[PDB]
């Protein structure tokens, strides 16, 4: 039912990398998907540009706050994914790069 442009519900970690490293996508291209790791958790996948590897995809676990909430680092939590994505879009604040455009398909 009408997901966000960056929400790829059932996309695996491997295809997330494959999709983000594909043409049309660039630095800061990202998506959020169900985590391969934990119950009801989600993971952030982001394409980043470095010196040695060139184009690469970095994956972050998005933790759940008991009874509601999300955070990547304990020093700043968010009531929802929209808040989390807006936050990291305007500031990397610890992340590898600022979130730019959702993965384009």
């Amino acid at each position: 039912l009408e997901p966000e442009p960056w929400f790829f519900k059932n996309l695996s970690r491997k295809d997330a990398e494959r999709q983000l490293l594909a043409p049309g996508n660039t630095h800061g291209s990202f998506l959020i998907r169900e985590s391969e790791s934990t119950a009801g958790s989600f993971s952030l996948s982001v394409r980043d540009f470095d010196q040695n590897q060139g184009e690469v995809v970095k994956h972050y676990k998005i933790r759940n706050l008991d009874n509601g909430g999300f955070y990547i680092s304990p020093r700043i939590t968010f009531p929802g994914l929209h808040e989390l994505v807006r936050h990291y879009t305007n500031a990397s604040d610890g992340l590898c790069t600022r979130l730019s455009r959702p993965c384009q398909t």
């Binding site: 790791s37 993971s43 970095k58 994956h59 972050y60 676990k61 990547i72 680092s73 604040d93 610890g94 992340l95 590898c96």
Partner: peptide, 4 residues
């Protein structure tokens, strides 16, 4: 998994 990358971390902040």
């Amino acid at each position: 998994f990358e971390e902040i």
